[PDB]
Design a protein around this nucleic acid. Structure first.
Ligand SMILES: C[C@@H]1CCO[C@H]2Cn3cc(C(=O)NCc4ccc(F)cc4F)c(=O)c(O)c3C(=O)N12
Ligand SMILES: C[C@@H]1CCO[C@H]2Cn3cc(C(=O)NCc4ccc(F)cc4F)c(=O)c(O)c3C(=O)N12
Ligand SMILES: [Mg+2]
Ligand SMILES: [Mg+2]
Ligand SMILES: [Mg+2]
Ligand SMILES: [Mg+2]
Ligand SMILES: [Zn+2]
Ligand SMILES: [Zn+2]
Lengths: 65, 47, 260, 242, 260, 47, 65, 242
DNA sequence: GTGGAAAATCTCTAGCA
DNA sequence: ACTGCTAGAGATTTTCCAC
DNA sequence: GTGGAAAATCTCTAGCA
DNA sequence: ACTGCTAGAGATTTTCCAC
């Protein structure tokens, strides 16, 4: 069930930000969570966002629908 | 070498030039006559 | 030309005319005019039009003391969510703040406390309380309220709510608790359409869940990647692969990537 | 689409809940809820318990989350209605209190506490409590020397009991358990909200008789006519709100 | 449904939950929740996120009194150009301001003075001075400094200059005059790459030139236009005609337009 | 009919509702108990 | 000379603004000046900007170029 | 293109300046300036004059713009170097003073006034003045009864003299004349700036001999070789800086 | 049509009591 | 019935120089 | 593929000492 | 070596509802 656990970790939403943009970017897909950085995928674009700029949730309103 | 002109805190008069010791996102650590200070980049100018 | 820059230097020493005035009047390139301006200390009176970003980690709390009706309200906000714990204290003292923080650590997982340098926050009692509970103490640059933006914002918001419920509580502590309740559980919006309480539950639950899942995958999915040193595989798919390269996470297309 | 039969048979032979089906067979939670609710043979997180513990001439109000063992303990000046109402208001503000169990005491049945429960929405009612209180006693005794005051000792004990103490089914602390339980409660609330949102819609397929809408998907509409959960292409089924 | 509106109102009466909270919790349309919120007086605590724009006519001057080193500096700015006249006055009195304004009217065509409601701008002496020189007097909304957004800005800029030339002047009046000189003639930029003095010269010269040219064209280019009422022609070109229609200027393509 | 909730001047507390008499760009003229006031639209909300 | 005085009137530049945009619009071409409004033409778009939002100049750095 | 021969011929037969030849023929003003700068037979705005006029025991410093009749009049406490230096500093700040004429008086030759002229850039030097001062005196005599102090009377007289006395070539007030004159000076300065900017460029056409550049355009490059202004397509002429 | 420095444009902030 | 702006500092984008 | 109400998104401001 | 944000009010843009 390694694939299923991978899917579970990809079921989260990561609202992140860049260095100069103040607005919170959209809900990317959490590919990997690490101590200092989180690897996400926003519209087929793999990014490494620092932990101090990432909000990882699992939107239950969007999950239970 | 970098020259940093900074407004440290509650002092409208600007100071410097000081020596830049470290540059980050929104904070510069500078050395003015052996005095180490941290200044938001909104209140620091680097040349 | 180069002998026409001494006139620019003189007129700058007298009038500190900006680079554009020097360039236009003395027929100079913008480069040399800007160099003349940049050589004068008196004309360095502006920073960069930017705003940094505060730490939004799941375990960082921002604290501050506000004053209302001659009473001190100690307010803590979860930066990642927006969940506020507030209390009216008798006077602004280090021991009152230490008790507030000790309460906070026991009810939510505080891993870092961000505060202004106020006499109460920098005391030794608060330092000992943080040491006991294993809290990292972060202090903003002196007289830089923007560093604490989140909590400062909350004050405004919090005060707003009080002004709407102050006719339902005879004392300020009851109104403060009502405002905290309303902000936490009756004011939704934000990122997930949540309220602050739901948001904090979600953030903490997701942190624990993803930590557990990642530990499981690491225990299982063990690989080494030899692209183009022996990095550690993180995520492979969609024609690309993410690899931790001696603490330098790099993403590379499937080509020139060997997962051994 | 093409995943319902396995879940239905699994539930028939194991009477399993709806999260299991919705996570193992990848269906929208509403349709799994309907599957579990269609069989009659196959048909809490917000309740706290309040108590007073007297130590060193000081009364400690302890609120225990019976589902998790999560303690909120604080010393209060006196067993007065105002102080207990303040404690209840704080408890409501921090965590989602829905009902509170007391001991019918003099301080738990005052007009002030009654109006505090009424305002915060709490609903008053008159072996987890005893075990958790005893655990607080033990931990306070362990960490009473580290502080000069009983309030600080109580807060240290609450912190240890909630977090430093790891015991349970999987070696989990009370904080993690309460976070998980409240997350599940939020999930249930979202499910009920979406079910009530869609329940005002009737779908006609192919006309045939009306139907109950379970999922207006992007490219597949799942409805149910007479306990028959069937998926249809969007070019077959027409809805009307009533 | 409509019976859930009663519970939404009852929860709003206590908690004043925002429209989103009521819509989510009580299963209401956004319109109904928003209407319920909009019916409460205590939840109307925010204006509209906008900023008006000040009058930029060529003949409007903005005046204000600033304080530096315990000395009053009366500052006037040409809004259309940015050209400032400043003077250090002994005390913030109505007579000093009247003298300043009378000086100003004789050196540049002041057609209107925009000022805050300060005790020295609403005086009767200033009223009489304005009457004499035919100046319209505008007063900003009380305690609305943004209305004077131009001159106040100069109070900053001017002050900055005084901080660079202060060591070259032994008294504040001389430094103020030096700062006015530097801002007007040695600090370029702006719309035309000009300095404030050249910008004001250009604005006024263009005003007179366009006035006389337009008077000529009106004296000669006379027409009556019927489109789709006997309005008056302004500009016919590129197949599009501009017509003044009883003070309602309308631009219409060549079709459905007759210049008689 | 329009209800205007306004913050006239140097008073954090809001007031109203007040009848709306005129609406411009950055200024609303309102009547609150026969008192006519001009409020910048940054300090007036119309319903 | 009525076809060249028109050119003279159109040799000016009108930096204007709208009712919600704070930044000054580019140098349109002054087609007509009136007591209360100015009719200008910015990229083949005839507009009627109020006088309280228009800066009419005759930029000489450009005229002498 | 087209109308350059017309410009040169009109000039030789009428020795007209460059503004006329560049507004009646639509040339780049640099090219017209070059055209007028080719024949020897065809080869001020910042001039101010100070004076002191004494009325009622008060000295009024009057600065007259010779080209326009534009008066700046101020009653000053005394004929001291400080007061005249202040007046000069104000005059420089408001209008572009280049050189200034005085009467070699004791107030107009002090180290303070010298340093004020040096700082502001003014250059000291020792029938418009008399007529304009008499006009100011007459208008002050007219409007003295309309004010108490003499400073107010002086300012009223200055306002009337500058803006309400319409007498001249076409009924123009002094303010209009000074605005027009300063506008013309700015125009001349811009033209000289452009000329000095291009004068470092050498252009070769078709090579042939070098050339002096007069205008580079979108698709027309106007240059000149041996007092011969000719236009060339950009695909024919190459520039360099030297 | 291609790269590289350079000039223009755009974005954004402190301070004006 | 009246109204935020200015000037500077980086960053990004065109644009002209040379093939 | 076409319009209309509605929901989402984006822009922008007051106030936090 | 550290750092502006938040919540609300209008306006604009998709988007689904019905053919
Ligand atoms: C004596 C302590 C220690 C030293 O610093 C002072 C002064 N101070 C000032 C503000 C303040 O300026 N608030 C307004 C504000 C303005 C802009 C913004 F981004 C955030 C904002 F909060 C505070 O909030 C605050 O807490 C303090 C404070 O506590 N102290
Ligand atoms: C006693 C008079 C009459 C009644 O009003 C007061 C108070 N006041 C206040 C500011 C002021 O708030 N300046 C800071 C500022 C802030 C924001 C902005 F957009 C512009 C700004 F200037 C003034 O400038 C000012 O001149 C006055 C003044 O003169 N008065
Ligand atoms: Mg503080
Ligand atoms: Mg604060
Ligand atoms: Mg003022
Ligand atoms: Mg002011
Ligand atoms: Zn300088
Ligand atoms: Zn309300």
């Amino acid at each position: 069930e390694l694939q299923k656990q991978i899917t579970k970790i990809q079921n989260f939403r990561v609202y992140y930000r860049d260095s100069r943009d103040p607005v919170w970017k959209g809900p990317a897909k959490l590919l990997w969570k690490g101590e200092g950085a989180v690897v996400i995928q926003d519209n087929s674009d793999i990014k490494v966002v620092p932990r101090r700029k990432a909000k990882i949730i699992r939107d239950y309103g969007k999950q239970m629908a | 070498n970098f020259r940093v002109y900074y407004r440290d805190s509650r002092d409208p008069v600007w100071k410097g030039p000081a020596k830049l010791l470290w540059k980050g996102e929104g904070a510069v650590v500078i050395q003015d006559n052996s005095d180490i200070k941290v200044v938001p980049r909104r209140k620091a100018k680097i040349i | 030309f180069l002998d026409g820059i001494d006139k620019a230097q003189e007129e700058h020493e007298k009038y500190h005319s900006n680079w554009r005035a020097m360039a236009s009047d003395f027929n100079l390139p913008p480069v040399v005019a800007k160099e003349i301006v940049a050589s004068c200390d008196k004309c360095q009176l502006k920073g960069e039009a930017m705003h940094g970003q505060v730490d939004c980690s799941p375990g960082i709390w921002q604290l501050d003391c506000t004053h209302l009706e001659g009473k001190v309200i100690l307010v803590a906000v979860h930066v990642a969510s927006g969940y506020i714990e507030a209390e009216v204290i008798p006077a602004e003292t280090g021991q009152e703040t230490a008790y507030f923080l000790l309460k906070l650590a026991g009810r939510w997982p505080v891993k870092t406390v961000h505060t202004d340098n106020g006499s109460n926050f920098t005391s030794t009692t608060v330092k000992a309380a943080c040491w006991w509970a294993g809290i990292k103490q972060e202090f903003g640059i002196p007289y830089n309220p923007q560093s604490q933006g989140v909590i400062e914002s909350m004050n405004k918001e919090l005060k707003k709510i009080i002004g709407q419920v102050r006719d339902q509580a005879e004392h300020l502590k009851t109104a403060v608790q009502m405002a905290v309740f309303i902000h936490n559980f009756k004011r939704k919006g934000g990122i997930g359409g949540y309220s602050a309480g739901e948001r904090i539950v979600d953030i903490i639950a997701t942190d624990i869940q993803t930590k557990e899942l990642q530990k499981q995958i690491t225990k299982i999915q063990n690989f080494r990647v030899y692209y183009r040193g022996p990095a550690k595989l993180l995520w492979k798919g969609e024609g690309a692969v993410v690899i931790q390269d001696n603490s330098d996470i790099k993403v590379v297309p499937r080509r020139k990537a060997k997962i051994i």
